[PDB]
């Protein structure tokens, strides 16, 4: 099963946003092997921000 296959326009826009935030200065521990838990984390913090 797949909840996020990372190709749709708004998820790829979010992908491009955090790739740019990587490429600006620095972030924490690396990438290229993602996790759906991190996507749920991002969406839950977005839920809290909208709330």
């Amino acid at each position: 099963f797949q909840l996020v296959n990372y190709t749709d326009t708004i998820p790829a826009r979010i992908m491009q946003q955090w790739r740019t935030s990587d490429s600006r200065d620095h972030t924490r521990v690396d990438w290229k092997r993602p996790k759906y838990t991190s996507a749920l984390t991002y969406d839950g913090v977005k839920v809290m921000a909208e709330a």
């Epitope: 790829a12 491009q16 955090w18 790739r19 490429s23 200065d25 620095h26 290229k32």
Partner: single-chain antibody
Framework: EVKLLESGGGLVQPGGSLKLSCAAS????????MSWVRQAPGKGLEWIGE????????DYTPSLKDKIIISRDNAKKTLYLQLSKVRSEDTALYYC???????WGQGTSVTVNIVLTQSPASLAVSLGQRATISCRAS??????????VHWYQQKPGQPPKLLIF???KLESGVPARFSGSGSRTDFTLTIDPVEADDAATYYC?????????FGGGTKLEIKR
Amino acid sequence: EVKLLESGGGLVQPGGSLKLSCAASGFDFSEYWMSWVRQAPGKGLEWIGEINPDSSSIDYTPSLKDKIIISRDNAKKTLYLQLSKVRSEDTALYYCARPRMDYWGQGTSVTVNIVLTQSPASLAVSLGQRATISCRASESVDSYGSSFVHWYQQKPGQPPKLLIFLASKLESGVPARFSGSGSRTDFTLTIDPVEADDAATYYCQQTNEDPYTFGGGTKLEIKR
């Protein structure tokens, strides 16, 4: 502004120890990560390692782990590199750099698949002109719409300053004399106007996936 100064370099005997310091000024070293990268004389660069601000995870290359130690001091804002049992391959120019706000320090000299091809190898351009340097990648370097490729210029005795970042943005401090463009297999850096101080070796490096490769080096000649 951001300033990094390396010290402790020079000459060292084979088999001994060596400690190089790198002081920072103008920024906060207690939040920004640091990195160290080596460069052989006449060859490409080689990333030695990276270290975080809290000194909790210091990463390095898998082939140079038994002879390199990276530490930092946030109170003094100074990084430290310790080498033990130096060999003939240790005669190189090391360079401490910020988290690549990408800025690289001067470094110190110690004397004891993605393929990026530059085009051309050497060219001579007059003053006040516009030069073009192309770069071809063997694999796709495009990820999430942004091309994560940096263009730097290193001179003889000078370190490679990060000129162009992400193939579409100019770095702070450098004037509006270098632009970048391209698409997904071919990158192109343009210089307009051409000054006499820009006579150095240009290098395009992409760090999209493993391994982080570097460019072949394209020297720029100023006509007279």
